[PDB]
Amino acid sequence: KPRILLMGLRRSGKSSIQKVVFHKMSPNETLFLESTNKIYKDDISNSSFVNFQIWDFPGQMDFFDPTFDYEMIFRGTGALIYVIDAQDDYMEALTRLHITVSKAYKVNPDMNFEVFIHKVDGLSDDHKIETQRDIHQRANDDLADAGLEKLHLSFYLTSIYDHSIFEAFSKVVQKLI
Amino acid sequence: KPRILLMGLRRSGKSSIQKVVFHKMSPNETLFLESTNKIYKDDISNSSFVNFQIWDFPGQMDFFDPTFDYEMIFRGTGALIYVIDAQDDYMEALTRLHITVSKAYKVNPDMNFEVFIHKVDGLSDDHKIETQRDIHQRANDDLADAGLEKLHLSFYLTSIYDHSIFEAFSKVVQKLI
Amino acid sequence: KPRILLMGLRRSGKSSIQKVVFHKMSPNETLFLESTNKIYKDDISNSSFVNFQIWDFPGQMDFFDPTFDYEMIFRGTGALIYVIDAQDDYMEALTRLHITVSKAYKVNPDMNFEVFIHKVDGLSDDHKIETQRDIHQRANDDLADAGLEKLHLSFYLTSIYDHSIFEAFSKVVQKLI
Amino acid sequence: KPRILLMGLRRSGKSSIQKVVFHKMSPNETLFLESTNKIYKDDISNSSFVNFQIWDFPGQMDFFDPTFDYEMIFRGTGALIYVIDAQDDYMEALTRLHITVSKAYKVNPDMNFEVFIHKVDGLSDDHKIETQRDIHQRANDDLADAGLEKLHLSFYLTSIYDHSIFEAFSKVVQKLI
Ligand SMILES: Nc1nc2c(ncn2[C@@H]2O[C@H](COP(=O)(O)OP(=O)(O)NP(=O)(O)O)[C@@H](O)[C@H]2O)c(=O)[nH]1
Ligand SMILES: Nc1nc2c(ncn2[C@@H]2O[C@H](COP(=O)(O)OP(=O)(O)NP(=O)(O)O)[C@@H](O)[C@H]2O)c(=O)[nH]1
Ligand SMILES: Nc1nc2c(ncn2[C@@H]2O[C@H](COP(=O)(O)OP(=O)(O)NP(=O)(O)O)[C@@H](O)[C@H]2O)c(=O)[nH]1
Ligand SMILES: Nc1nc2c(ncn2[C@@H]2O[C@H](COP(=O)(O)OP(=O)(O)NP(=O)(O)O)[C@@H](O)[C@H]2O)c(=O)[nH]1
Ligand SMILES: [Mg+2]
Ligand SMILES: [Mg+2]
Numbered sequence A, B, C, D: 001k002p003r004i005l006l007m008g009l010r011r012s013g014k015s016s017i018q019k020v021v022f023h024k025m026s027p028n029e030t031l032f033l034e035s036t037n038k039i040y041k042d043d044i045s046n047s048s049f050v051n052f053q054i055w056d057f058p059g060q061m062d063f064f065d066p067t068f069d070y071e072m073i074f075r076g077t078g079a080l081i082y083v084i085d086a087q088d089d090y091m092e093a094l095t096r097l098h099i100t101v102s103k104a105y106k107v108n109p110d111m112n113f114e115v116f117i118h119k120v121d122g123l124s125d126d127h128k129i130e131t132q133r134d135i136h137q138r139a140n141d142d143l144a145d146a147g148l149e150k151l152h153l154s155f156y157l158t159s160i161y162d163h164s165i166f167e168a169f170s171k172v173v174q175k176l177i
């Protein structure tokens, strides 16, 4: 069944997203989530829903940890959602995005890359658009510099406090089935 | 006990309607519903509610599939709700509506025919009214051409994102008890 | 423990009130409630809540049914909530209110009489006030004519679609503890 | 694991806060909470949340009751949340706040003192600010008079009817981990 990864720096909102979208958590409650220290493999198995697996990662996985066979993980992955906290400085997020998608694409160029520009409830509508544009351009420029123009990133403006996170996650799922 | 069918093209919103109205699903969650591949017979049995059965059909049932005795099904049916996605082109929906209600009426002319012009949260109020008028007129004209003027269609403007789907489904139930 | 009765004509909203306030029912779902045909004794027993019993009656109890010892019921009752559908004609409701409270007061003049002018979500704010005034004056005039000036009615404007039903029911409970 | 106390006069909203934030209670339902007569020790233990213990106290603990070793309790306490009903007169609340934090600080000067100026949904925004200022100044002046300038109070404007209670409680938790 399709496997979707949730990756991104600590505090970007990965666990909140899976809890709100798939486990009926109120967004307000997500403030009390513990920081994630083990990969959590969430089987969306209910007989009425599309069936797929979501892997909620600890933020900022260490690609040098020999416990983690990232190549094997990526070869079995249909989509990688990279979550960026739009309310915070995102230069490190952009660096880690690049490292992550370049490693994934090299082993599975059929993977879909989905960038959630997240926590946008804290931004004005115009600033959401400017933030997406800056992220889009910087991320694509980094890809171009590395000879990875053919690696396509899709961008989404998301918040757990409205419909947008559900719409975004649904678009990601629908591409895989 | 009364039997109500949910029919309509794939993606019209049948399963969403039954989940939101009768199973406490958030409308946002319905984005992740699987396409329905078997008739689901939902017994509304709770001791505090009106008791009736809802049959959630796969979209666009094949009237030529010999596994399905539609005449027998219709003879035991009190109401047929035909769901139309108002945000999409509805010419095929209108064709299939006509085929469906004409077949049902021929075996059970006491059946109530209930047309949910659905997903109206994506329409302006004026466009909702124009869409209902166009559907109403086209559907009635098709009935007239087939000599089925006495077959009455009732029309409802519905969305899972507000009270309207509950109000509509309640009106359908109340007519049967 | 305190006993509170819910009485009123059929369809006034008695069962909706108890379901929404004490059983987490969405107001939208109450459209599908069956008409009540037996007294339902609801023990509010949760260890965190005030403990009391709510008796949800069939609408328009028959005072002439010899199965029902209304005097005994009233002698054990702390408050009687009489629910009136504000969206409907309320002349019969006023007649039945009078009959009900006069019978109750005669056996238990310590009972509290609480009139919920209900379903006010369908009224303008000014019309809510005029409706309460008309009900208040008519009900008190009927009491005066019967020599029951000392029987006090309290009036509340309520809806299951907002905080008002909770506020009203809380006021009734607080008077008893 | 961190221990957080909820203290404050009766009816200030302590139990409502813990129920709404940590037990999915609707704010409307909190109207029916019983007055608390025993300390309730609530272990926030879910494997996805920060793990800590909340002690919901009866309002206005009696420091002279020999059943209660307040010094021992305070020595094991990371934060003390003192809840003040902003809609009510708060002179007694301020007196009891002072007594409480001075006793706590004397045995555990590392404790965090968190004052929730609560029920602010009943105040205008400007009156919220003036109420916080008056409470802040009066509380600090009392500390200064007692030679307790180094005892720091943090102030929060909270309501169970919006995000503010969640935000406030989250800030308190985050300071402890
Ligand atoms: N304003 C706002 N805050 C959000 C949003 N999504 C998550 N948060 C907040 O962001 C914080 C961190 O969320 P969390 O899901 O734990 O992040 P994470 O990416 O799983 N962290 P880790 O990698 O350490 O496990 C929480 O306080 C949460 O409520 C959002 O859309 N808007
Ligand atoms: N905007 C909007 N979308 C809706 C509404 N009702 C359903 N949807 C969406 O329509 C899509 C299809 O819904 P679904 O209930 O699976 O349709 P179905 O008619 O059961 N399909 P099938 O016949 O294949 O089983 C979902 O993404 C769902 O969220 C509505 O009122 N508004
Ligand atoms: N608009 C609106 N409708 C309401 C309100 N309360 C209840 N209703 C509706 O009124 C109808 C009847 O409700 P119900 O609770 O069954 O009434 P009842 O007084 O228990 N009837 P019976 O005496 O026959 O058992 C339902 O369709 C319900 O949704 C309200 O505050 N506003
Ligand atoms: N308007 C409003 N009312 C609130 C708020 N928080 C609590 N309340 C109300 O305040 C009342 C008392 O709440 P409760 O939680 O029992 O208070 P407590 O401090 O635990 N009392 P005790 O010390 O006796 O146990 C309830 O009616 C509750 O609904 C709030 O933010 N706003
Ligand atoms: Mg996490
Ligand atoms: Mg379906």
Ligand SMILES: [Mg+2]
Pocket: C014, C015, C016, C034, C035, C036, C056, C057, C058, C059
């Ligand atoms: Mg009833």
Ligand SMILES: [Mg+2]
Pocket: D014, D015, D016, D034, D035, D036, D056, D057, D058, D059
């Ligand atoms: Mg309490």
